[PDB]
Each structure stands twice: as structure tokens, then as C-alpha cells.
Amino acid sequence: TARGTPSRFLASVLHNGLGRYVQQLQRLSFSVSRDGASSRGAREFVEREVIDFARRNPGVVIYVNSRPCCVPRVVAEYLNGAVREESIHCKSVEEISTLVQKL
């Protein structure tokens, strides 16, 4: 609800639209298991579309870690220091490609 949860005012980071638009992602960090069915779509995202993604915005520096995890995570870090760590566990390739473009 709204009386339980905090609230804020609609703002931007550093007047993000006035002079120029600065892309607000700094990093994406993928943990992706080499053997594991939970990261089946996450392996196909790295194989197919993370190279098309890392050229569409050269300000985001992307780290694919590739360690033996059960749950693959994506750790989006932004320009104001905020960290939004989300999971791509058992998601198809079309569902990670919109989850990352949302980030």
C-alpha cells in the first residue's frame, strides 16, 4: 500500500534531459552457470544477444562472470550509486532481452 511503503517526488538525476541525455546504467553483471538448466536462457542470451546489446550502448560495461550458480542474477548498477540486483532464473531468451532493455 501507499501508507506502508515509502514515497518520493518525480525527479531526474542531474537534470537528465536538459542539456544531453546521459545513459544511466554503468554496469551489468551476469552470473551464468555453465552446467545448469536454470541458466539455459541466460547462456543463450550471452551467446546470441549480449554482443548486440554491448554495442547498442557503449556506456554500459558488461561483466559476464560465468561461475557455478543455481540462480543466475543480473546486477544492474546505476550512475547515482543504486544497485538493482534481479534474477533471470529460468527465463527464455526473449524474456531476458526485455528485462535487460528495461534495466
Binding site: 500500500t1 511503503t5 525527479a11 537534470h15 534531459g17 536538459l18 541525455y21 545513459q23 544511466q24 528495461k102
Partner: protein, 101 residues
């Protein structure tokens, strides 16, 4: 809806605008332009020859997770649903005006 819009401000719309972040957008359908000493107001819109309201796109977020719960007493009727409506944020860059009167 109708947004009272000045320059260098922000607007939050509750739908995806199928745009890229950063694309400058000319908002048509201006229907009242005012200054400290005059105002011009259309019938019902001002012409495109007269006003040019620019807007960038900053962020294409989702809303905060926003609950829909249904309940009826003594009927075992209880539903819960959590929706996040997609949102976009426009920054109005300039309200130019041209002498076409």
C-alpha cells in the same frame, strides 16, 4: 489528459511511448500558451505554425508494485493481483512561439 507545462520540467505518463530514451519529441495539441503579459488560447487547439513544444524522453520505468485485492465477506471470495503499469518520463525542453497571428 492536459498537462500544464513550462520549460525544463518533467511529466510522468502511464504508458509506454515506443520511443528510445533521448529522442526529442514535438508535442502537438497545444491548447493554451501564456506569458506574463499575454496568453493565446485555441479553439480548441493552437495551430502548429504558432507553437512548438519540444520534449525529450528520460526514463522508461515501471510503476511501483500496485495491488488489486478483492474480498467479499462470508463467501470465500478473495483474489489478489499485483500489477506494475509501465511509465515514461518526458522532460520538456523548450516552448517556442512564432509570430503567426
Amino acid at each position: 489528459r492536459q498537462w500544464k507545462v513550462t520549460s525544463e520540467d518533467l511529466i510522468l505518463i502511464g504508458n509506454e511511448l515506443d520511443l528510445a530514451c533521448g529522442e526529442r519529441i514535438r508535442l502537438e495539441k497545444v491548447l493554451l500558451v501564456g506569458a506574463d503579459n499575454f496568453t493565446l488560447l485555441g479553439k480548441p487547439l493552437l495551430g502548429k505554425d504558432l507553437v512548438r513544444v519540444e520534449a525529450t524522453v528520460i526514463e522508461k520505468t515501471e510503476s511501483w508494485p500496485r495491488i488489486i485485492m478483492r474480498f467479499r465477506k462470508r463467501k470465500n471470495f478473495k483474489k489478489k493481483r499485483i500489477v506494475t503499469t509501465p511509465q515514461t518520463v518526458l522532460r520538456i525542453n523548450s516552448i517556442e512561439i512564432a509570430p503567426c497571428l
